[model samples]
Target: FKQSIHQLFETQVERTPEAVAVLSEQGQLTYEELNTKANQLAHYLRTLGVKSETLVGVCVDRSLEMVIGLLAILKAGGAYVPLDPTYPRERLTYMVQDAQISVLVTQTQWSNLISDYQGQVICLDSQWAKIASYSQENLVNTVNPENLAYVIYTSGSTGKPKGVMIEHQSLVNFTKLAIAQYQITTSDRTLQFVSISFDVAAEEIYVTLCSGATLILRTEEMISSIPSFVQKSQDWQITVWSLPTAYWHLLVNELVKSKIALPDSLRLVIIGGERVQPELVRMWFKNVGNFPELINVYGPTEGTIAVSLCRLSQLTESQRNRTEIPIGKSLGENISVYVLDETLKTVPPETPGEIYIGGTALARGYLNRPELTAQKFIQDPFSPSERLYKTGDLGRYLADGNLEYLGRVDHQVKINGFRVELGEIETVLLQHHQVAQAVVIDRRLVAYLVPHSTEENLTVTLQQFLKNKLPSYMIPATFVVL
Candidate 1:
């Protein structure tokens, strides 16, 4: 339909204005209320010079405001860049300057979160009177499918967060395919489990919204324990859960150990962001059964939220002996996958090569990184695709045409579903004058270093330094000095 997230959501709103659209501890909102609020804020955003491709910062936590903030940005024909307000100050400042956001939608309590930002700040709580003054009618959207939808920042090799520019078309394609493949319906409810800054949040939010399903904002208590999670799923009748691969293991093992079936309403479980072991899939089938089906998905941030998905109904004998289940096939015609050698030639089946992705789902290259973008996303000689993202991921096509994931082609690694560039950590470590040489390996984020001289509190000091610079997942678990 060549529609954007807001457009698709609006369609659902009109169809079911009275249906509950979002539920959170903060509050609940029907489709009518949500859309009307978004419409007003969208026009207000236009007053702040937000338009097509304009970057707007959304800094609210997981609340009704967060969803409203995101919708208003797109409805105003601007792309929203979700900023984790809880992140380190240095990281927030860098992201703000890089995107050069024109407006920030946040709560009054976080006024100083990014004090350096000179953009107009609109607090959903304090400024509601001013926002409600605007008309509730839908703003005439000038943004097309090609316009930037959002810019997600991912860990870069150069010690900087690279913003991946996703177009409306790319996000819409994902939403459409996800709803179709997952068989999401108005009767289903999806848990909004992913963090707002993560791209998968878009999938969790929009797929459920556009399909006229309820989206429950997970509480801190719900995530505190698996039992809490299961309780909410049953209490809220959550039909779908899109979670990280590592976290899913906890759920599966807990189910098997506790001898509990999935919540009666829970029907589908989508997992990705890291490799999924075949053993885990087998255990899920054996214990959790195939009804609360398991689907393994894969894609890089540069290739949109996800390009391909594999639904594991059962495993073959060959797959049973494999290390991890295949990542399955492409989601739809919106994107295509290829495994090629150094020369860009498609490798034979079972031969490992770099995984490359191309099509509408591919991001519009890295933001403001022309040279690096050109290096990674390039012409496709093997097909009519104009550009393809050279994902550092190593994979090979199985005889049945599914993509079997191999290890990475570089030092990039995923720990607990978060991507980390070893070089970035080394660069951060090198920033410390005491460290003469530094190296970071992906053995559970172990950092090896040679100091300028013998230092007693070196490890503790370095650990403290990293805590202020990087996220918890990227921090080294152990430091070894030689």
Candidate 2:
């Protein structure tokens, strides 16, 4: 129904101008109001030379303005690179510099931290008075379907963050398919809980907005605790919940133990980003029953959010009891997935191999990393002229055509739904002068120092040292002095 993401949002604005579009802690914005404010910001950004393929960095806390900033960037024909404000300054700086972001949208609190960044900074909250002076008219949509929509940075094995470039076409295709799969409509209220940097957030935002549904934004304080966040979801009347499998596992445990009933309004819960524990599903069944659909989705960032989904309702008793759940089939006919062995041949059923994905759902590949792109996104032998992303994940085909995920083929692991390369953590550890060798095993990062060089409070020092360079999830929990 829409050619691009912005077009989809625009259509909803026209169809339901007075309806509440986004509900955040700061306030709620109607579709017309959000569109007008986004247009004003878009007009200002265009004056600053924002255009197709331009990268604009957006770093702000969860609020109504955050959504406005994202829409403004898209309407101005620039791809917004979400810079999680909570991340260490070093990591954020690297991403901003690597993406060559020319303009940054943020808040006053982050001004001094990013003061050295050589870009135009627009504080959405503090500069609203100045920004609102611009025209509230939509910009001509110059972005083509093939143009870049957003660049999501994910952990790389080479001690750097790689930006995955997702085109407008890929996003539109995925969002439409997801809306259809979830049966999202104007009556549904989806929760926008994940960080904007996470690719799944894009799925939630685009699909909800395009379907004319309301999006409920969660505050940082709300998500601070699992039980509290579950309560917040219920209070917000969230009907469609798409959260990480790990988060769902924790929330379900809390709900069952506390004897809290699942929100009556909730109709769908899609979980992914890591292996879903079958016990969690069984727990849900035991407590909440099967009123709300539980679907397990699986995909890498390269696949534009998700490629396959398995509804728990359709799973057989034996399948549900497996150590790992099946990832199910592709979301739509636009994509194709293959489990291939080392020689590129399709593996037999129940045999693990590398998962290769191709078709409209595939991303444009890593931003500005042609070699890495070529290495991972290779020519698809099955379809001429099409490329397939070689996801490092390992999975096998089931006899019934479902995909059973085994695990990662490399040292990369999903830590709280964020992809973490163990080598990246080890690389940061080796940066310390006192550390001679480093290794990450079983999610426990260990640093082996040279003999007689371990200083007093070395663990505390190393922990503090890592805090400046990495996110809390990337920081090792245990420090062993050798």
Candidate 3:
């Protein structure tokens, strides 16, 4: 028998009532409390005519109420589309109408955004005892594996944002895989770093909850404040934390400057979101040498929460000089990869091509956008029944069968008929000892660098450093210092 994610959580509530399920700024909630709260919200949403597959726009801040609203929508068999409160009003408006969101689950703070919408506004804090206590014995609808779980809209270079349709089974599969891979348990406490809108939040919520681990959701201010954040980690005893490589760079500097040791409870530092610099990773390992693991996680929202994970054993001196960080292996079973050329034929080792992902974990394609969906979700040529998703990432399979991700196919440009990868230039720039962050835009062939030290000269310093690694044409015509 199959069960919705909400049902799975409800089962956990019965099985482990006293287990810590969620920890947020508001307060910590046991599985019992979380289930009860979600039940109340679900009942209230049902009363507001929310039914199966109904797209409910949930405008929320990064808070406990967002969890309440999401779980409630899932329990009612409706999909909750998170509308970021910090997102532009016009963007929020477009997403709401595009998703055909007829009802809103929001707090009073976000009332302005939904004021113009002709839909039922169900306040997250609307009712307490009534909905929780109300029994829906006659409500006998089941959520299929194919049903929409959540729709996270990613920004488009042109036109409206594309809503990625994550199916129910995709969520279950990912949650099950991540929990087992990481060995998450009731004793573990995961720190939620990503915004609720991002796909990474899926890993934070499910891995923590499904494995009976405690989830600690951090606020914007809390994440930025070094002393307070470090002190709180010590006080609360947070175990596992994840962050983008960009932010991790800054945090490392703070740790060294403050001369404060990482809390003894902290064990794992999960890194992702960008190409992590080998130098930054080395610095992190040197500082937190006591930790059990420092993992590099990789996956686009198109794939579930995470598809690949690499754990560092020891940061050697040779590793500090390298640019291509190893992405490591796949998460679980029921998936295969294809590195195909432009003609969709498989490519050999060391040859750059598109990375096609085929699996049970692949999402159901973009919501209500058939053209885009058909373009990406092509029929699997290798297997008749399966579907393959074009990741747009260019990679080559090693002789050992492990995938090594190269830059994007389009991300490479021919300057004077010489094919130059933008990532190659960015890698060369990041290799500089004083350069902290670097981003190379292929469109303009422009490189933006954030210096590690204020005293570093932008032009002469970078030129002296890159002269060894890059030729004249490959070196960016324009460099901007921030």
Candidate 4:
């Protein structure tokens, strides 16, 4: 059946109208209530000329309103582009212009932040009265499976952000598979851990809602420490949790050192967006036992959310005894994975090659970059007429048909599950008038520079300049000037 993402949620609403749909720090909303609120806002958005193919910018922190804004966009037949407030203003401005977004949904807290934006602005908090005047009934829309669902911006090797355009069919496919793969039930409470700017947030939000489960918005205090994490899990009675591999690595170290008992409510923990460490897997079983099952996932934004998933049971004693753990098999029937050689031919078992993702879950392509899109998303000669995304990541299949993740083929890497391009850092370094040349190395983000002119506090000046332009994680730990 051809359907949109919002239509899938609408079906779940019919079956479980009385169930709690979303739980945040502010309050909770039942399925029926959330549905009606989104309906009204969708009607309001329609009045502002939003329709199929329209891109609406959602600029708000993680809250009940943020979810509502995203849902309303889809219901209005428009795709949403998340504008994370934590991002630098220059980046936000560039994204808004690049995606051609005409309307921005935000709160008054960011009024000054987007004051200069040349678009229609709708403040969710102060403008609620106007939205409430609209009808609560669902509006008829022309949106179909092939229409755009969302546009996610990622770090580009050329120093500019590229938007990956996902379709409603791709999102719907991932949501349906995740609900079954993770065994989500109405009684389960899944934490919304990933930031909205990333594609994983779509997995956390849609999988929980479309499954008729409670989606809990994580508060700041819940992650303050290991004790806080344990207590918060019990307090919310969370059953499903998904975290970045880097974050899971740190939490494992803390849990081992503190010897804290995990909450009994959890039944699943998924770690992804980067390579998984075998030592951490061993440490988890050694201290935390096997109550909450851990799964390693792998995928790029262009392949929807995740293409492959590896359950804890899939790991054998021999696999855990080594340094690398397999990233597992394809997620489900909607996805296809192949290890291809340089010429795009499938490689034999135990032969290293680039991972290519295909099938229904692949995104449409990068927005407004047809040349680059054609370059990366190639036609699959193996499966005639189908498209495949060439993930720069290197991996090889084992004799047991499991993918063992290797390193990247380029300078692109992930830090805390956020993609970072070494070229982007180097591009920004050359912007400084004093620096003649610059090179950045990962695994601590150290910068080595050759300068034409030097100042008394060049390091401090450079740090200040970078803090205004880049995220905190991308900031170099140390600077060397010669």
Candidate 5:
């Protein structure tokens, strides 16, 4: 096994150079074609001082270029920082400055986002002529297993985003285990439905390429509607699917209502990022026969893509009837899962405790925030040298040794599969002059106003204020005043 992801990808290219590696709107690219483009970009990046430990920012639309940019950064011995174009400019500015990225890779359409950034800009779409002039020879990989592979930003309680730094070894371990457990093959067509900002997208891309499988990408429009995506999946004969639990639940409702059979080509379906609704699993058994293996995966970004999984077929009928499905055990032998009480001791079965994850799959820590990183990622007691990420998520182990997911132990909540810190919203709400007290409950941000002013459209004013400061997923569903 290789320490670097791009090295592993090169081995796959040697075996299947001419095979269709990625299917995107920009066009389908063979393994050889993708490798050549990545190599060229890597050579160009090296000229700009990219090496081990360098952070490179990539902000591009969902296309072939986005995938190429990520691979090139890693090949050039730099960790790629995903910058979602849709994120607020304030947030993007903070990340670019915090990471101290030396270069920003993007498309012409998103050049405006980095107009004020001090870093060098390489617009892949507009500068293709210049990028293509570089040598296609692969650059020597200097990234070690301990070096960062990528930095995924997640919501923070301190009203700012935090980048979780995942090492090459963590990704390599997880991807190899996932490919083996899922039995991925060259014939498998895995769907890439998630944005690169989400760490799960890394699994989709890495597993597909490393296993010589075909990576099928969806346009932004294609994934907007679940029903249409399901229809497209059947049409494309997709074999593997990974999606958020809430998103999969939507498709289940559509299928049960329409009496449509599950896609015959689907061999695996992974749903996670929220509690797996037991009723949703029951619906699959009732409607679709010989359904794909329904796996409920559980993990925070700090523990790589996923540390544990639960197979729906293995659940007891009684357990299936319950509200929440078990998240099961660790995905690989190198990983460890534990539920600990306030005293940091493992609790007995059926007793709720905060879930703590450790072993090789654990991330290095947050980027540029040593204090916060030290607070969340603590040294393991049993193995003093090993680090464990305190997930803040509560869970309990069942009598059968399966892990059951409880709600978050803190103000952080998962809204539509995105981790959101409620306190961040509360902090912003209180910034308004009219708000005396603010609280965010169940994703509904409420503000207690001062002086009970009869101002019309006050809610609209507050909403517009928050919209500029936060992403849409963090926006509250309702506003209240006292």
Candidate 6:
């Protein structure tokens, strides 16, 4: 078994040097070829004075060279900040400037926008040519596992970008645990869809490479034409496909109406990244009841990929009555959870509270923002010797060990000093036959409905449905149907 950060990929390369490692429209790279490419790039980057801890900005799409660039950055003992080339210039500029980038690796299309920077710029052909001059060496450094690995910038609620710094060990544990949970194998081919800038993509790509599975990269445009893409995916011999809940919901509906076959090569499907919908699951299994495994993966990026997994075999009638599914238990060995109230007191079983997580997978802290870091990442009260991340989510343990998610404490509102759960209210509204999508915020509700027919009157229909189900005060004061 791999014992260190670099050893994870090194072990994979050693075992299956001739196997396909990555695939995109550009071409495919075998394990030995990918390692050689990365090693060559690492040697050239060092000559340019890209030293350890250097914050390198990696701007590219889901392409073959992107993998080479990512591995090269890690091999050079530097942390990279990933930037999606497709993002608006303003957002890309914010990450580049905020991360205090020392070098940028991208394609020619982005050269005009980033050329004005003082840092060094490396394009694919130029970097590859530079790599050609150097010999592959045993270049994995004597770096600490706890050293910074990457910084992912998140869109803030207040509108400024906040970079969430992750250590090498967090990703190290994630790859190990995720591979185990999914039973990843060299035989498996993972369909990679998330944007490189998003945290979810980090898990998607890294887990595939670390497990010696082939990564099949698809463009964002390809995702929109999912039916065509899904049909072609069988050509890649893909065994697993992971997507966000919204995308799966849309695809499942199409599969039901069109009578599409779930690809024979695909064996597992993991849905994550946002709120899970039981209605979506019902529709999915209703069509392809014998399809491969369906699992719910849950975690904030601060957890350094997913910390829990819930496998959905089939939903009972009672489960279909609710909107969300149980979030399941933790992954890996060195993780634990605590459900606490505002004062950090452990709430009683079956009561909702903020979810606190402490483990090896917790991120090091926000980069260069000690004040904010100190607020969220604090000393663990339960263990006293460790630190914990205060997740804003709220949940409680059931009679079984599984966790039943409740609404966030901050998401709840007090009306005339009576505590009200927005999730529960939205759940009730969605139960109405005419309602399709329900979102409740700020005590005002908005329902986005696509009716049975274009001629249905939403106002009269919804008013009558709620009148039969809810108390007078429980009905939303204002409801907008879109």
Candidate 2 has its poorest 10 consecutive residues by lDDT at 443-452
Residue 355 lDDT, candidate 2, scale 0-100: 94
What TM-score does structure 3 among the candidates reach?
0.82
User: What are the RMSDs of all candidates, in order?
Assistant: 1.4, 1.7, 9.7, 1.2, 1.6, 10.2
Q: What is the lDDT of residue 65 in candidate 4?
A: 88
Off by over 4 Å in 4: none
- Residue 335, candidate 1: alpha-carbon lDDT: 88
Candidate with top TM-score is 4
Tell me model 1's lDDT, rounded to 2 decimals: 0.87
Candidate 6 colliding pairs: none
Poorest stretch of ten by lDDT in candidate 1: 313-322
Error of 1 at 92 (Å): 0.4
| 1-482: candidate 1 lDDT, tens digit per residue | 56888999999999999999999877899999999999999999999899998999888989998988899999999998888876777888788899998689999988888856788999998999999999899887569999999998888888887889999988888899989999999998899998877899999999999999999999878876788789878888889999988889888778878866578988888999888877777787777666877788899888888988887875565675677688989999868898989999888888999899988789998888898899999988767548889998889898888888887878888877787888888988998988999999976888999988758888789989988778778888898988
lDDT of 5 at 344: 82
Residues 1-482 of candidate 2 have per-residue lDDT tens digits of 43879988998999999999999866899999999999999999998999999999999878898899999999999999999888888888888889999899889987866537877889998999999899998788668899999999988777888899999999999998999999999999999979998998998889999889999988778767776776878888889988888888888888877977667789999899898888888878778777788899989899999999999877777877888788999999989888998877897788889999989999998998999999999997766789888998899988999998888878888777778888888877787887887777655445455524677887888889989888888877777655
The total number of steric clashes, by the backbone 3 Å criterion, in model 1 comes to 0
Error of 4 at 389 (Å): 0.7
Instruction: List candidate 1 stretches off by more than 4 Å.
Output: 382-385
- In Å, residue 446's CA in model 6 sits off its true spot by 10
Tens-digit per-residue lDDT, 40-92, candidate 4 = 89999998899999999998888888888899999999999988888788778
| TM-score, every prediction | 0.97, 0.96, 0.82, 0.98, 0.96, 0.83
User: Residue 166, candidate 4: how far off, in angstroms?
Assistant: 0.6
- Local accuracy of candidate 3 as per-residue lDDT tens digits, 89-152: 7668878888989888888767887437998887665544456676533234646777888998
Q: Distance (Å) between predicted and true CA of 18, model 5? A: 1.0
Where is model 6 more than 4 Å wrong at Cα? 1-4, 314-322, 410-482
Angstrom error at residue 389, model 6: 1.1
Every candidate's lDDT: 0.87, 0.87, 0.74, 0.88, 0.86, 0.74
Candidate with more favorable, higher lDDT: 1 or 5:
1
